[PDB]
Design a binder for this molecule. Sequence first.
Ligand SMILES: CC(=O)N[C@@H]1[C@@H](O)[C@H](O)[C@@H](CO)O[C@@H]1O
Ligand SMILES: CC(=O)N[C@@H]1[C@@H](O)[C@H](O)[C@@H](CO)O[C@@H]1O
Ligand SMILES: CC(=O)N[C@@H]1[C@@H](O)[C@H](O)[C@@H](CO)O[C@@H]1O
Ligand SMILES: CC(=O)N[C@@H]1[C@@H](O)[C@H](O)[C@@H](CO)O[C@@H]1O
Ligand SMILES: CC(=O)N[C@@H]1[C@@H](O)[C@H](O)[C@@H](CO)O[C@@H]1O
Length: 235
Amino acid sequence: GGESMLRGVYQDKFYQGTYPQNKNDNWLARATLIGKGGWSNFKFLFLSPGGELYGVLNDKIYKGTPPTHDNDNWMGRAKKIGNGGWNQFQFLFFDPNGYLYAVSKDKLYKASPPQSDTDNWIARATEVGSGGWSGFKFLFFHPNGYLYAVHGQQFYKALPPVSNQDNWLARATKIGQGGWDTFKFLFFSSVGTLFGVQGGKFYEDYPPSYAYDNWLARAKLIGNGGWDDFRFLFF
Ligand SMILES: CC(=O)N[C@@H]1[C@@H](O)[C@H](O)[C@@H](CO)O[C@@H]1O
Ligand SMILES: CC(=O)N[C@@H]1[C@@H](O)[C@H](O)[C@@H](CO)O[C@@H]1O
Ligand SMILES: CC(=O)N[C@@H]1[C@@H](O)[C@H](O)[C@@H](CO)O[C@@H]1O
Ligand SMILES: CC(=O)N[C@@H]1[C@@H](O)[C@H](O)[C@@H](CO)O[C@@H]1O
Ligand SMILES: CC(=O)N[C@@H]1[C@@H](O)[C@H](O)[C@@H](CO)O[C@@H]1O
């Protein structure tokens, strides 16, 4: 059930709405304002597959159901689940089953998310990757459980590492040979459609399946202008 709404932070404000389906749709003019300010200094701001919003701010991490209207004081009701060290991460993201993945100091870690202030998450997390993980530009999951990654200007996908003895990049399938480093945002919707913002323009299409598929030549243009101004843009 339910396709998730697109969300984004633009000029310190938080908006939500169904994603735009053509370049004549002025998304910002119709989107619901779900936060009046305070959103631009989060380092990370993302949603779990269970619908909980996670935010990293000033080295601490907070969670709560997302705000539904502009006067919902999200940070006043969010639960603080981390008191320090959350700005050390380069990436912080969920797999489809609710496990949190994190890249810190070139290593990849995985575990169920912290549920309280006193939980030393980084200490109990499993190290599933020992080196190479700060070299990616993007690292994100498809809803089918495959890990997608942009390395240099190349694009790859493969089931995630089973342990730190698993050399992921060596067995990954290459699904793109160039141009992937020029995107500002690159992410999946909840039904597996790939969405990307490249120089102000917003595109969507089924993801490439092999290195010679010219994704940008076939993708649908769903937005022209303003998308490079967002600080966060995600489903
Ligand atoms: C980061 C955060 O929770 N910001 C909210 C803001 O969006 C909302 O408009 C306001 C309502 O009083 O409370 C907070 O400031
Ligand atoms: C990144 C990480 O796991 N930081 C945790 C922090 O959230 C927590 O409050 C503390 C409790 O001892 O341990 C850690 O440092
Ligand atoms: C990016 C990548 O695939 N890194 C892996 C690393 O996680 C793993 O510990 C090692 C095993 O020899 O191989 C690679 O370096
Ligand atoms: C961003 C993008 O779509 N890059 C693709 C690239 O992956 C592919 O190898 C090439 C083949 O023609 O076309 C494009 O450039
Ligand atoms: C961020 C945003 O909503 N940008 C839209 C843009 O995609 C669209 O092409 C244009 C149509 O007039 O309006 C806006 O600028």
